[PDB]
Amino acid sequence: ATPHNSAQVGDFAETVLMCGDPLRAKLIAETYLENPKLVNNVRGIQGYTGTYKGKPISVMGHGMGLPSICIYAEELYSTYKVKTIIRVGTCGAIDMDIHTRDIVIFTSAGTNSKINRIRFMDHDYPATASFDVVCALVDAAKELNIPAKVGKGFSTDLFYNPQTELAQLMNKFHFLAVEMESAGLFPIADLYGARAGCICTVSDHILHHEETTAEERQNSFQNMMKIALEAAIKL
Amino acid sequence: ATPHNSAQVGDFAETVLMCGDPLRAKLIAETYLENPKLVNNVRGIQGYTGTYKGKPISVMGHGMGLPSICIYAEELYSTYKVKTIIRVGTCGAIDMDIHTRDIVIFTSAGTNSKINRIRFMDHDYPATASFDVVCALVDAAKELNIPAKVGKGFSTDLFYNPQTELAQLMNKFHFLAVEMESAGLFPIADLYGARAGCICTVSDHILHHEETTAEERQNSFQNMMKIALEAAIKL
Amino acid sequence: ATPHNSAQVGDFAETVLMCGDPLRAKLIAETYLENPKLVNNVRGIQGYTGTYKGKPISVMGHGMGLPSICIYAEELYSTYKVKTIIRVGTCGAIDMDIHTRDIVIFTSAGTNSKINRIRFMDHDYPATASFDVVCALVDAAKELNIPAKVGKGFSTDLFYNPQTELAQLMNKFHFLAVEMESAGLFPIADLYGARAGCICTVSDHILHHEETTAEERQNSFQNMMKIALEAAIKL
Amino acid sequence: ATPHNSAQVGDFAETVLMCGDPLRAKLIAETYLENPKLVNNVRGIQGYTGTYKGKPISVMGHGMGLPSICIYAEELYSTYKVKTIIRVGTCGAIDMDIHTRDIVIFTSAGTNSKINRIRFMDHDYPATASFDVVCALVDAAKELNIPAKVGKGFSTDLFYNPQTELAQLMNKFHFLAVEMESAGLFPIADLYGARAGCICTVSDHILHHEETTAEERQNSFQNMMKIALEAAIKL
Amino acid sequence: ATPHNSAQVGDFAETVLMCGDPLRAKLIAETYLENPKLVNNVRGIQGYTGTYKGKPISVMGHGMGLPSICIYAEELYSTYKVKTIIRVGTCGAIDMDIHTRDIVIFTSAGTNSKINRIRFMDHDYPATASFDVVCALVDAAKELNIPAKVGKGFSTDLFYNPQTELAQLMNKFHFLAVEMESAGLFPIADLYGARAGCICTVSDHILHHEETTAEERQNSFQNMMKIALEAAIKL
Amino acid sequence: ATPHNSAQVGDFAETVLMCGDPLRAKLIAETYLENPKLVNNVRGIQGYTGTYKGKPISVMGHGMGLPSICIYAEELYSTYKVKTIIRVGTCGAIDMDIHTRDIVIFTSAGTNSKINRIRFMDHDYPATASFDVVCALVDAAKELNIPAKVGKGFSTDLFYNPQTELAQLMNKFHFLAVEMESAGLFPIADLYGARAGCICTVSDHILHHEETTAEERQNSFQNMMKIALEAAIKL
């Protein structure tokens, strides 16, 4: 149907969970969905559609960086009539009070990208997570009683960032974590009158060395997944 | 104590309601607070401190525009140790589905200002309302059962905006309303590890002529005030 | 007549003196004008119209920051057909050769704001004081024989400026003082084919501790006021 | 060895061919290399190392967009000590004199991204292909006698570009094609004192409908691959 | 003494008149100065030093564009200890009320250049003519009773400007004329604690066809020269 | 024919060599061309047209800075129907591996100017030398067997650059040399479907003191000239 998707309108559920790693997306599909069917694998993106608690749900990769997720999100909202895209994955902690293996719910995401300035007449567009999605993620967290931190995230274009001072600046303004897609996703959802959200488990800290026990990193991941899945049902 | 405030540390409650109109702030103090005492009137700003349901509460004006509210907010968070600043006032609707006299709860605010870019190494800072404050405002709305719209707002530096195309662009991205302070307030709260939020009643629509009945504009205002006050207690 | 002014066309003199402090404006009206009448008090702005040496003159506050004064200036030039707006007030010295209590006449004002870039296709607009007004202010200074310094001013959006290096940069380029309105005012006057100017008394120095004797600060203020008033007559 | 690569120093050849599609990279490895061995598949990136005419050569995917390829390129140049990265893939034609199925050799790439401005003190960095690589690609083209167009390319962050006027502007300045990685790749090669280049086959035209015969699109692809491979040997 | 000047400290008068055309500068030297001596001709710049009414005066070309005059001005203020640089030349009218052959005195100059933003931490620097020089030029005009227009000028980097809408924008803000050096000159004078000014005769109008009689264009030029010369003496 | 050129269509050869120094251009004309005739001297620019090996060739100065060369290049390509403009001159070395008296062939040029951003919708335009011209210059170098370095150049607007850190940044990215015209020239050639190139001899190093023997600086210059001339014939 599109340059980056072979599936046809209807193959995708109206709620799609997206992560960077296509293998992760394949794992998710095989681990949490019932009767997952590969509906799209253009560029080995691993797009699946199965069910969770009787409801239709799709999981697909979105590469890394805003330019990438921007392609998938717009194609999904526009061509496949998707209504909700919840980004699920890992990220790097910034704030000193955030520890590795912590789950973070993005209220919004800042960015060093130029995309939003391009779509917003060079002004400051607040890449804000859909309020419904934020509430669904937080309610899920509360109901499952899984500690989660809610706040600003930051979508960087430079994983290896030359501006090393930026990190401390972000810690001063209390940015919770860093990833590479949210700031691009959120505004595209607004444009299509659709919804977007993001939940991540901190896989590493950028300001100091952390303690990462083998079974603690997985628990954290599974916990984030439960929240994302339950919230999807609520939506 | 400061160049723009004569009050001393302790004169202000830890939760402060701020609007642009100092006369409005005086009205609010005399109408909703018990035993309101004028603690600061430098520049006729009308800063009061009284009580609501037994709890300490302060109401003060903040002029118009980010540069203005930036002065008051930082002085309050820094010198008077205020913890929460809820901006309460009027605004101009953008989105076609938003009508005059509607109450809007800001999740965040975009801006055509350069301030946040100055404090954020020229990148995109997401002026986001403190999540606690957004939730307190929405819960108050729900509990009082007062219809309110939650979403992005826009803080403009140009009330009379030369870029007339911006309005339609904002309607396409579904910005709810336009005011002139939120985008400045939110990031200053983050810096001080404090909290900020904004709730406004739409006094006019920028894309078309609206119907404004005399008693409907006041009800709307009183309703917004109830929500702001109750939320303050919850915080 | 406007959203921020209740007065009608004709209530304002064609020459208006504006300062940030509305109480200051009230003081000015009661101290230097004959038969001052409050023609507008929307937002406690304290707008008066009286006479000086038989001629009509208006004094009104304009809040703090470019976004604020931008609203009043354009409304005045456009709706009330005002011809001259002279900003009168305080400011912070930059240049080492400028001392507290010194009177400064702005030839122009730089800014860290984005407004002029918005109205000027993102190029460098030189916020220049109307040449007639500069000459009227300087002639008044010379005739009254009151020492005044003439040069560049700087209108900041950040009273509390994160970019602490900016101050020394400005001292190197010899910016005389810092305030928060001129850069916005000047270009709006040009747009309306009208005139604008600014004169300030330095109330404090930003690069070092100064000596401020009680009666020296008032004399300085009264002197600045005489110059502003006489120049108004000349215009 | 890295967050996005499991291979160790030595697993990668000093010359690496990179395309967006990981499946394409797998195809390339199985079709043109002898004894290709999968040395890295983190994120299903499909990184292989085999031989071409007795020489070591690696082929791996790089996702879509500058942020993505920026991660891989820097990791490869820095950790795996790679010397040459030749981007090989598809692109969209701009210039009217460029037709679908045409092969284009990038001399350089423009971009609407902010990355290079971030690494270059906000000035204009000319994302230029390593001269050795450009010459190797052009010599290969000449020796194989395969018609190829040499000129500027454009790396966009927005596949779906809101600024629809940009296309005609680029046609006026004769930008040959559009892709999404070159502008990020080239400067990273310079930083590491290494080399980078890009060759693409136009899979579609952005200014008008083109004729794409089944066997013409493959020939074009195979031809581009021959040039890329032979040039690699020359390097 | 410098890369662009062979003269030594002392060869140049403390007041230097500069125009773009080196031949014009040679003409000026031979026509208005007594005993003009060529003190520098690096790059055929035609730098002379002679006398006017017994006082030392130098005339030299400065090429075209800010980058050019920036080199000469800084070298002159820094190495040759020059105190005043008055730019004298031609320009293109913008404002409809400005006619060909009109003399214009710059109060300041706007620009589409990035230089001042580079030297001013990316903020708005008001390229303002030294107030002493503006007054000297205007007094000379008044004393000689030669009609002159005083106001903003604009220094463009693009004589052939792609942004054709800019012209009308400038006419709306009443920019008097367009040249290519003032915006660069003025800030360099400030940096060296020295002085700069600019006076031009409009040789053509950019918004419509004008009437240019043979002897009217010369008179205008001679008149501008008298003003520049007399003002130099006053300084 | 134009404001800066008195010559008529046909007076200029289709290939024009341009340097900053008009005296240098005069020298070149008298030293390397047969029967050189001065076809244009507006502003003492020294524009000549003679022959080299029987072929028509023109040499003319272009002042200093992008704004300057932009005027000449566009007038030449547009009015005089010139096809190739090869900038020939001096420059300042950046990279530590570049020594004084070294000849450098620009593949492209970066810049701190705003021109290209103005003509390119505020995006990154890669000021790239025409590939034909680069190849002609390099072939000439190879055939004459004159060592030349090929790579990025940088066209600065600030000969005296306040941003002293830029130099080291450029050395890290391996910018070969610095001049003041290429970045402006290259894009104008693209616009006119014409060609441009640049070759310079390093007259000084910006990062350290160099050894410059009298006869080594001239040899270097003559060598650069041979390459430029021979390449012109090849084109």
Tokens of B110: 């975009």
Number of residues in chain F: 235
For residue A70, the chain D residue with the least C-alpha distance is D158
Residues D26 and A32: their CA atoms lie apart, in Å, by 28
| Chain C residues touching chain E at CB-CB below 8 Å | 107-113, 116-117, 119-121, 123-128, 131, 134, 150-152, 163, 165-166, 169, 172-174, 183, 187, 190-191, 193
Owner of token pair 């251009």: F25
Q: Which chains would you list as touching F if contact means 3+ CB atom pairs under 8 Å? A: D, E
Residue spans of beta strands (DSSP E) within B117-230 = 149-155, 177-179, 195-205
Q: What is the DSSP string of chain A?
A: -BTTB---TTSS-SEEEEES-HHHHHHHHHHH-EEEEEEE-GGG--EEEEEETTEEEEEEE--SSHHHHHHHHHHHHHTS---EEEEEEEEEE-STT--TT-EEEEEEEEES-SHHHHHTTTSB---B--HHHHHHHHHHHHHHT---EEEEEEE-S-SS-S-THHHHHHHHTT--EEESSHHHHHHHHHHTT-EEEEEEEEEEESSS-----HHHHHHHHHHHHHHHHHHHHH-
Amino acid letter, residue C197: G
Q: Which residue has the tokens 């002897």?
A: E215
Euclidean distance between CA atoms C160 and C65, whole angstroms = 13
Tokens describing residue E214: 């043979």
Exposed, middle or buried by CB within 10 Å (0-12, 13-18, 19+), for E110?
A: buried
At C102 the three-state DSSP class reads: coil
Query: In the structure encoding, which two tokens stand for residue C84, read together?
Result: 């001259």
Q: Is A23 exposed, middle or buried (0-12, 13-18, 19+ CB in 10 A)?
A: middle
Query: Pairing mode, if any, of strands E149-155 and E103-111?
Result: parallel
The H or E element containing residue F23 is helix F22-32
- Chain B neighbours (≥3 Cβ pairs under 8 A) are A, C
* CA nearest neighbour of D108 among F116, F9, B94: F116
Of A44, A13, A65, A40, nearest to A185 by C-alpha is A65
Answer for the pair E31, E102: CB distance below 8 angstroms, yes or no: no
Verify whether the Cβ–Cβ distance E66 to F157 is below 8 Å.
yes
For D53-165, where are the E strands, in sequence order? 55-61, 84-93, 103-111, 149-155
Q: End-to-end CA distance of chain F: give it in Å, rounded.
A: 26
A133 burial level (CB within 10 Å; 0-12, 13-18, 19+): buried
Cα–Cα distance for residue pair A28/A222, rounded to 1 Å: 10
**Cα(E194)–Cα(A30) distance, integer angstroms:** 75
Amino acid at D158: L
**Which residue of chain F comes nearest to E188, CA vs CA?**
F160
SS3 F97: coil
**Total length of chain C:** 235
Q: In whole angstroms, give the CA distance from residue A197 to residue A181.
A: 11
Contact list, E126 vs chain C (CB under 8 Å): 108-110, 126-128, 152, 183
Mutate to test the interface with C, among B28, B64, B202 (most CBs of C within 10 A): B64
Q: Which two tokens stand for residue C217?
A: 């600060």
- In sequence order, the β-bridge partners of residue C199 are C88, C105
What are the tokens at F97? 């591996």
Q: Are E16 and E85 in contact (CB under 8 A)?
A: yes
Q: What H or E segment, with its residue span, contains residue C70?
A: helix C66-78
CA F176 – CA D1 distance, rounded (Å)? 34
Count of B–C CB contacts within 8 Å? Answer: 113
Contact D145, D223 (CB under 8 A): no
The kind and range of the H/E element at E45 are none
Phi, psi of C205 (to 5 degrees): -110, 135
Helix H or strand E segment including D102: none
Q: Distances in Å between the alpha carbon of D51 and those of B106, C186, D35?
A: 59, 70, 7
Which of A27, A41, A42, A43 would you mutate first to test chain D, the one with the most D CBs within 10 A?
Answer: A43
Q: Which amino acid is at C158?
A: L
Would strands B47-52 and B34-40 be described as parallel, antiparallel, or unpaired? antiparallel
* Residue B69 token pair: 């509210």
Choice among B21, B157, B190, B204 that is catalytic: B204
Q: Nearest-CA neighbor of F2 among F56, F47, F66? A: F47
Number of H-type helices and E-type strands within chain C: 7, 9
Residue B23, number of CB atoms within 10 A of its CB: 16
- Category of E70 on φ-ψ map: left (φ > 0), alpha (ψ -120 to 50) or beta: alpha
For D24, list phi and psi in degrees, rounded to 5: -65, -45
CA distance A187 to chain B (A): 7
Q: Which of A116, A120, A128 sits opposite B108 (nearest CB)?
A: A128
Distance CA A106, CA A202 (A): 12
Tokens at residue C41, please? 């008090």
Letter for the amino acid at D107?
T
Q: Give phi and psi for D148, each to the nearest 5.
A: -140, 145
| Cβ-based neighbours of B162, under 8 Å, separated by 6 or more | C118, C119
How many domains would you assign to chain E? 1
The whole-angstrom separation of Cα A38 and Cα F180 is 57
CB neighbour class for D35 (10 Å; exposed up to 12, middle 13-18, buried from 19): exposed
CA E2 to chain centre: 22
What separation, in Å, do the N-terminal and C-terminal C-alpha atoms of chain D show? 26
Single out the residue of B209, B202, B218, B206 nearest to residue B151, CA to CA: B202
CB E129: neighbour CB atoms within 10 A? Answer: 31
Calpha distance B207→E64 (Å, rounded): 47
B105 closest CA partner among B204, B176, B24:
B176
Q: How many contacts, defined by CB atoms under 8 Å, are there between C and E?
A: 97
Contact (CB, 8 A) for D182 and D138: no
**Could you give the CA distance from residue E14 to residue E10 in angstroms, rounded to a whole number?**
9
Question: What is the C-alpha separation between E209 and E187, in angstroms, rounded?
Answer: 34
Residue C104: strand, helix, or coil: strand
Q: Cβ neighbours of residue D96 under 8 Å, at least 6 residues apart? A: D171, D207, D208
Q: How many Å apart are CA F156 and CA E68, to the nearest integer?
A: 11
Which residues, other chains included, contact A157 with Cβ-Cβ below 8 Å and sequence gap of 6+? A65, A66, A111, A112, A113, A180, D66, D67, D70, D113, D114, D115, D118
Q: How many CB atoms lie within 10 A of CB D206?
A: 17
Chains D and F touch (3+ CB pairs under 8 A): yes
Going through chain C in order, the beta strands assigned E by DSSP cover 15-19, 34-40, 47-52, 55-61, 84-93, 103-111, 149-155, 177-179, 195-205
DSSP class of residue C173 equals: T
- Do residue D112 and residue A118 have CB atoms under 8 angstroms apart? yes
The number of C-alpha atoms within 13 Å of D181 and in the hemisphere containing its C-beta is 31
Distance CA C138, CA F71 (A): 41
User: Measured between alpha carbons, how far is A175 from A151 in angstroms, rounded to an integer?
Assistant: 7
Min CA distance, B180 vs chain C (Å)? 8
**The two structure tokens encoding residue C181:** 């309105």
Hey, CA dihedral for F65, F70, F75, F76, is it positive or negative? positive
Q: Residues of E with CB below 8 A from F71's CB?
A: 64, 159-160
List active site positions of D.
Answer: 204
CA distances from C171 to A88, C178, C202, F163 (A): 50, 11, 15, 18
Structure tokens at A54: 């009787």
D154 and D109 Cβ atoms separated by less than 8 Å: yes
For residues E172 and E235, the answer to whether their CB atoms sit within 8 Å is no
Q: What is the dihedral of CA F167, F172, F174, F180, to 10 degrees?
A: -20
Nearest CA in chain E to F64: E68
Q: Where are the alpha helices (DSSP H) in F159-213?
A: 165-172, 182-191
Instruction: Choose the closest CB to F63 out of E64, E70, E119.
Output: E64
CA–CA dist C16, C2 (Å, integer): 17
For residue C40, which amino acid is it?
N
Which has the closest alpha carbon to D188: D134, D112, D135, D109? D109
- A vs B contact (3+ beta-carbon pairs below 8 A): yes
Q: Does residue B61 contact residue B46 with C-beta atoms inside 8 Å? A: yes
- Bridge-based pairing state of the strands D34-40 and D47-52: antiparallel
Exp. method? X-ray
- Alpha-carbon gap, residue F76 to F231, rounded angstroms: 19
Q: Give the relative orientation of helices D66-78 and A66-78 as an angle to the nearest 10 degrees.
A: 150
Selection from F167, F179, F176 nearest residue F206 by Cα: F167
Burial class (CB in 10 A: 0-12, 13-18, 19+), E56: middle
Alpha-helical (H) ranges within chain E are 22-32, 66-78, 115-119, 131-144, 165-172, 182-191, 214-234
Report yes or no: E82 and E14 within 8 Å, Cβ to Cβ: yes
A180 vs A90: CA distance, rounded Å? 10
DSSP C42: G
Q: Domain of C50: which CATH number? A: 3.40.50.1580
Please state, in angstroms and rounded to a whole number, the distance separating the CA atoms of residues B17 and B136.
14
Cα E178 to Cα B14, E70, E199, F116: the distances in Å are 56, 17, 11, 20
Distances in Å between the alpha carbon of A130 and those of A179, A182, C23, F29?
18, 11, 44, 69
**Cα–Cα distance for residue pair B124/B110, rounded to 1 Å:** 10
Out of A126, A134, A152, the one facing B152 most closely (by C-beta) is A126
For B128, the closest chain A residue by CA position comes to A108
Dist. CA B123–CA A130, nearest whole Å = 22
Q: Which of A75, A92, A78, A86 is nearest to A40 (CA)?
A: A75
- The answer to whether C36 and C48 are in contact (CB under 8 A) is yes
Closest chain A residue to the Cα of B121, Cα to Cα: A166
> Are residues D235 and D136 in contact, defined by beta-carbon separation less than 8 angstroms?
yes
Sign of CA dihedral B159, B162, B163, B167: positive
CB contact under 8 A, F67 and E21: no
Rounded Cα distance, B209 and F58, in Å: 66
CA-wise closest residue to A102 among A227, A3, A1, A190: A227
Specify the DSSP element, H or E, that contains D184: helix D182-191
Contact A74 D156 (CB under 8 A): no
Give the 3-state secondary structure of residue F36. Answer: strand
What is the helix (H) or strand (E) element at residue F178, kind and residue range? strand F177-179
Q: Domain range holding D211?
A: 1-235
Question: What tokens appear for B37 in the block?
Answer: 């005492």
User: If residue C11 lies in a helix (H) or strand (E), which one and from where to where?
Assistant: none
Spatial separation of the C-alpha atoms in residues C228 and C218, rounded to whole Å: 15
CB D49 within 8 A of CB D57: yes
Q: Resolution for this model in angstroms, one decimal place?
A: 2.7
Select from C53, C18, C45, C22 the least CA-distant residue to C181: C18
Which of F92, F69, F76, F104 lies closest to F13 in space, CA to CA? F76
Q: State the count of interchain CB pairs (< 8 A) between D and F.
A: 97
Cβ-based interface (< 8 Å): residues of E facing C: 107-113, 116-117, 119-121, 123-128, 131, 134, 150-152, 163, 165-166, 169, 172-174, 183, 187, 190-191, 193
Number of Cβ within 10 Å of residue E53's Cβ equals 10
**DSSP output for A13-79:** -SEEEEES-HHHHHHHHHHH-EEEEEEE-GGG--EEEEEETTEEEEEEE--SSHHHHHHHHHHHHHT
Integer Cα distance of E184 and E72 in angstroms: 11
Residue F204 known to be catalytic: yes
Instruction: Using an 8 Å CB-CB cutoff, list chain B residues near A96.
Output: none
Task: Give contacts of D125 with chain F, Cβ < 8 Å.
Answer: 110, 124, 173
CA torsion angle for E227, E201, E50, E80 (degrees, to 10)?
100
